[PDB]
Amino acid sequence: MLQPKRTKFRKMHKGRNRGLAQGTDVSFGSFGLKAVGRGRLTARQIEAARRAMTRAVKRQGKIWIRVFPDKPITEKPLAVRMGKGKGNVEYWVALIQPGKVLYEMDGVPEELAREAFKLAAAKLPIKTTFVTKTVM
Amino acid sequence: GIREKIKLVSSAGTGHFYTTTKNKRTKPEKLELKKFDPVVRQHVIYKEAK
Amino acid sequence: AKLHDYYKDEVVKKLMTEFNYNSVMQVPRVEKITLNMGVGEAIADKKLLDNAAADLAAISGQKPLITKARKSVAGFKIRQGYPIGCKVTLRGERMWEFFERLITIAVPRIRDFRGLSAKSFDGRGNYSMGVREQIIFPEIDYDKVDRVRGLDITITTTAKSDEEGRALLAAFDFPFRK
Amino acid sequence: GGSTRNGRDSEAKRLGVKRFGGESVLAGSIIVRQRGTKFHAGANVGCGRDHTLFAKADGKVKFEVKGPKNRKFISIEAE
Amino acid sequence: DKKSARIRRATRARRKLQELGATRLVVHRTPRHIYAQVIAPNGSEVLVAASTVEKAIAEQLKYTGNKDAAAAVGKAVAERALEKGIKDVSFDRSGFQYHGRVQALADAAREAGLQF
RNA sequence: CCUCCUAAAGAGUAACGGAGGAGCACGAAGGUUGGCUAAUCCUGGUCGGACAUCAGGAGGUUAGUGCAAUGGCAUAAGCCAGCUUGACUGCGAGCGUGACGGCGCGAGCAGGUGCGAAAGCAGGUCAUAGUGAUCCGGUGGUUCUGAAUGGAAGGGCCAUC
RNA sequence: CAACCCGAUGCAAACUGCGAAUACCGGAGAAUGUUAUCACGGGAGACACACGGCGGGUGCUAACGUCCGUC
RNA sequence: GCCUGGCGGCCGUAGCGCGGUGGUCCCACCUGACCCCAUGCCGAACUCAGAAGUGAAACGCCGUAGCGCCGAUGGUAGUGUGGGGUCUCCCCAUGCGAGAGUAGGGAACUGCCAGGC
Numbered sequence: 001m002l003q004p005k006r007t008k009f010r011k012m013h014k015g016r017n018r019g020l021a022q023g024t025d026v027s028f029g030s031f032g033l034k035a036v037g038r039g040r041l042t043a044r045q046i047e048a049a050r051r052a053m054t055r056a057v058k059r060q061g062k063i064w065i066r067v068f069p070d071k072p073i074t075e076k077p078l079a080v081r082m083g084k085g086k087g088n089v090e091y092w093v094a095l096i097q098p099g100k101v102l103y104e105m106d107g108v109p110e111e112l113a114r115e116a117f118k119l120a121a122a123k124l125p126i127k128t129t130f131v132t133k134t135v136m
Numbered sequence: 137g138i139r140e141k142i143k144l145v146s147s148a149g150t151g152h153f154y155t156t157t158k159n160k161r162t163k164p165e166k167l168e169l170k171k172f173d174p175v176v177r178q179h180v181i182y183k184e185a186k
Numbered sequence: 187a188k189l190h191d192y193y194k195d196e197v198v199k200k201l202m203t204e205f206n207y208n209s210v211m212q213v214p215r216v217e218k219i220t221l222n223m224g225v226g227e228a229i230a231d232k233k234l235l236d237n238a239a240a241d242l243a244a245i246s247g248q249k250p251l252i253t254k255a256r257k258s259v260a261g262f263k264i265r266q267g268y269p270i271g272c273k274v275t276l277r278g279e280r281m282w283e284f285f286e287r288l289i290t291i292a293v294p295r296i297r298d299f300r301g302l303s304a305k306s307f308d309g310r311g312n313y314s315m316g317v318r319e320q321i322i323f324p325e326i327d328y329d330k331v332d333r334v335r336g337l338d339i340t341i342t343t344t345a346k347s348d349e350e351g352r353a354l355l356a357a358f359d360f361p362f363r364k
Numbered sequence: 365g366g367s368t369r370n371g372r373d374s375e376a377k378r379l380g381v382k383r384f385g386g387e388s389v390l391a392g393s394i395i396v397r398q399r400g401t402k403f404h405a406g407a408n409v410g411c412g413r414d415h416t417l418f419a420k421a422d423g424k425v426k427f428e429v430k431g432p433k434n435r436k437f438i439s440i441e442a443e
Numbered sequence: 444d445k446k447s448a449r450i451r452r453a454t455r456a457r458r459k460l461q462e463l464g465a466t467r468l469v470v471h472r473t474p475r476h477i478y479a480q481v482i483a484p485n486g487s488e489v490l491v492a493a494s495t496v497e498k499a500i501a502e503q504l505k506y507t508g509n510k511d512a513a514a515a516v517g518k519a520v521a522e523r524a525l526e527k528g529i530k531d532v533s534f535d536r537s538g539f540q541y542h543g544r545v546q547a548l549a550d551a552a553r554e555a556g557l558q559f
Numbered sequence: 560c561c562u563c564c565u566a567a568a569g570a571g572u573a574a575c576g577g578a579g580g581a582g583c584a585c586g587a588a589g590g591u592u593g594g595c596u597a598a599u600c601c602u603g604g605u606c607g608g609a610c611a612u613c614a615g616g617a618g619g620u621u622a623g624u625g626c627a628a629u630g631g632c633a634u635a636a637g638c639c640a641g642c643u644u645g646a647c648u649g650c651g652a653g654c655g656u657g658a659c660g661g662c663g664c665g666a667g668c669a670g671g672u673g674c675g676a677a678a679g680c681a682g683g684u685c686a687u688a689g690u691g692a693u694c695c696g697g698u699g700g701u702u703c704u705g706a707a708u709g710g711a712a713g714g715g716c717c718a719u720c
Numbered sequence: 721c722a723a724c725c726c727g728a729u730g731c732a733a734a735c736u737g738c739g740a741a742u743a744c745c746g747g748a749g750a751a752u753g754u755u756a757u758c759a760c761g762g763g764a765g766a767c768a769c770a771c772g773g774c775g776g777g778u779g780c781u782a783a784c785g786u787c788c789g790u791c
Numbered sequence: 792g793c794c795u796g797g798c799g800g801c802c803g804u805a806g807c808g809c810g811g812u813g814g815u816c817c818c819a820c821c822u823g824a825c826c827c828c829a830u831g832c833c834g835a836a837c838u839c840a841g842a843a844g845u846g847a848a849a850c851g852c853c854g855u856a857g858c859g860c861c862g863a864u865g866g867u868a869g870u871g872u873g874g875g876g877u878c879u880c881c882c883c884a885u886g887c888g889a890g891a892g893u894a895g896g897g898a899a900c901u902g903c904c905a906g907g908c
């Protein structure tokens with residue numbers, strides 16, 4: 001579970017990506033996962049990864065998820081004809097691109113967060129990297 | 137619908153007339169309002185409107 | 187201008203020394219009484235309104251201004267029109283003259299009055315209190331009158347603060363309670 | 365299912381962009397629905413029912429901005 | 444505001460006036476005074492003027508804003524705006540309910556000869 | 560048939576693409592003249608409380624718009640009242656939009672109206688849906704025609720179902 | 721347990737207080753182009769298009785897939 | 792040239808706020824109101840006849856950066872033509888080049904007539 005509680009329209013178009021995300025430098029913690037690659041997160045993934053983080057940090061520490069699905073992404077049934085009305089919404093993906101701030105940690109050692117996001121990127125289509133708060 | 141096609145007639149001895157509609161359902165009062173009568177070439181009173 | 191004169195005379199200067207105002211053209215004046223008597227109900231009866239009207243026209247020396255409905259979506263119900271009352275502000279002369287029949291024959295013509303509120307004030311400094319029940323004062327046949335009544339009354343003074351709003355009114359014969 | 369339909373042409377836009385031959389009454393702008401996207405002004409005005417910017421007397425078109433807070437205002441002097 | 448009110452009221456005609464490219468004769472009013480001046484279509488340059496404030500009328504008068512005290516100014520404007528060759532102009536009551544002092548000076552200047 | 564996206568910042572463009580509406584409504588909901596301006600919250604006020612009406616402050620097209628949507632609207636296209644019938648007749652410089660049949664915008668001209676002191680506004684509604692070609696007939700009008708002549712039937716023409 | 725609002729981070733075909741390249745419309749100018757341009761008239765054929773590039777709906781940014789625009 | 796009014800220009804670096812300031816010249820409130828003319832109640836507004844009063848409000852000035860607003864240099868995004876890589880994306884030559892944000896700017900600048908000095 002991790003989708004918009006509401007929306008003006010049930011089905012959004014296809015569209016596409018163009019790299020270079022906006023939210024780059026962490027503005028909530030002192031660590032986190034970076035994009036480094038293009039792609040879209042099936043939400044369930046970002047959630048599957050989130051759990052990994054927790055199940056490592058044990059407790060102590062605040063986590064962030066600047067990424068969000070919000071994108072419908074339909075699908076067509078099995079043995080069903082073609083072009084007969086846009087298929088119904090199946091899941092919810094999260095369009096991300098190079099330079100995206102996936103998550104953010106702070107209340108934990110840099111050695112922990114490090115070997116915490118490594119267990120996170122484990123379940124991820126995009127190749128993420130580690131980053132620090134940095135003055136700028 | 138419920139709006140019948142009403143026809144206004146000139147008070148003049150001419151046969152010229154106008155046309156429109158009315159909601160007789162709630163306006164059973166024959167309408168009049170004066171309009172131009174090409175035949176007599178003069179603005180006069182027009183009646184008849186259920 | 188009975189009370190009116192008293193203002194400029196006794197009052198004003200009283201405030202000019204108690205508030206040390208620079209110019210006389212500042213001392214908070216009396217800015218019309220408003221009244222209202224929200225008949226509410228109406229809907230079914232409707233007559234209790236026209237009655238409230240005269241019952242109001244009696245008090246005020248002018249003519250009642252039957253109001254309508256703003257929201258028209260009242261929780262209860264009410265439509266766009268749906269009359270609910272009649273403000274009927276006061277006009278200088280009649281206003282102060284009313285400020286007479288009142289404070290001298292209104293609050294005085296009590297029901298169980300033992301002190302008037304001192305928090306009927308506002309922000310800019312405007313007091314407005316509801317009689318909670320028409321004191322049956324000089325109305326059409328005091329006894330031979332319509333079922334109950336009750337209404338509101340707003341003064342709305344030209345004061346800049348309730349604090350100064352105290353001086354005014356109190357500078358007169360405002361019953362109050364201390 | 366329940367999804368389809370559509371109006372049609374209804375061009376409504378600029379047909380007399382900037383200066384032009386500007387005849388006794390071309391258009392220069394038929395962007396209907398509007399009244400502020402192109403305000404009636406200058407030697408011309410009209411602004412017919414569908415708000416279609418008329419364009420009176422012959423001349424050149426202008427396309428101004430004169431007036432508090434944007435306010436297009438199409439005007440046509442004589443050429 | 445009271446002032447801000449009148450303005451918007453006349454802002455209308457004062458637009459259908461400019462648009463008409465006609466020469467309007469503004470008529471400002473006030474408790475102790477009455478004004479009137481004929482401005483060019485461009486509304487930038489003024490052509491004539493006759494206000495009760497001008498001693499030339501204030502003295503021979505009685506009370507600036509005495510109704511007929513305005514009518515005087517009314518014709519006064521006409522006087523100037525005539526020898527100058529100025530005539531036939533649109534009256535801009537300027538949000539002022541055409542009926543009293545504005546009514547006067549108007550029909551007054553009108554009677555004085557002005558065409559409108 | 561109408562509105563939006565697709566539609567790549569002129570027009571226009573497809574799909575069993577994504578969304579929502581029309582088959583009407585008003586003699587006032589039209590015309591004009593005069594005037595007015597919200598929603599929402601805070602404070603204070605009889606019965607009045609979540610919200611009836613009253614007062615003050617903040618606020619500023621977040622209201623309203625007969626009905627979808629988009630665009631527009633304060634000089635209000637929004638609201639109220641007086642007086643009215645321009646929801647007139649004949650024409651129309653000139654344009655927009657269609658393969659065509661058509662459809663739309665229209666200053667100004669003549670006759671006559673209404674509102675306004677006046678400039679002026681008015682040829683239906685804030686605009687864009689609210690619709691049916693031709694034939695065959697029906698009704699009124701007309702000295703257009705009318706098979707030897709005078710009539711008439713019938714036909715044309717204009718209005719119209 | 722949380723709206724609203726304050727600050728800090730993002731998202732949009734049916735969001736926009738911003739905003740290009742560019743296309744288009746018009747005006748003037750030189751050269752070049754064996755009138756290329758417009759109107760009218762005689763004769764047509766053609767209204768199954770396919771792929772590749774770019775912008776896209778649909779499809780799984782599947783298909784030598786499907787549907788538009790454009791070269 | 793000082794100040795004020797009417798009418799426009801341009802329409803936020805012209806606005807909002809906060810502070811000070813101005814007077815019977817103008818303006819403003821302000822006095823009176825049977826009356827002209829008004830109030831779906833009200834002389835509040837509109838309207839008329841005008842003191843006495845005062846700059847309190849509004850307004851007009853001047854000051855002030857807290858908030859709007861204007862805003863580059865540079866870099867980034869995008870993109871027309873030519874070319875290349877290649878998974879849907881991107882690079883190169885070359886012209887065009889934002890938005891945001893940064894420095895900074897900024898408490899309007901004006902014309903016509905009139906009236907007071």
Ligand SMILES: [Mg+2]
């Ligand atoms: Mg287009």
Ligand SMILES: [Mg+2]
């Ligand atoms: Mg294009």
Ligand SMILES: [Mg+2]
Binds near residue numbers: 685
């Ligand atoms: Mg409409």
Ligand SMILES: [Mg+2]
Binds near residue numbers: 767
């Ligand atoms: Mg075919």
Ligand SMILES: [Mg+2]
């Ligand atoms: Mg084919």
Ligand SMILES: [Mg+2]
């Ligand atoms: Mg094709």
Ligand SMILES: [Mg+2]
């Ligand atoms: Mg194919």
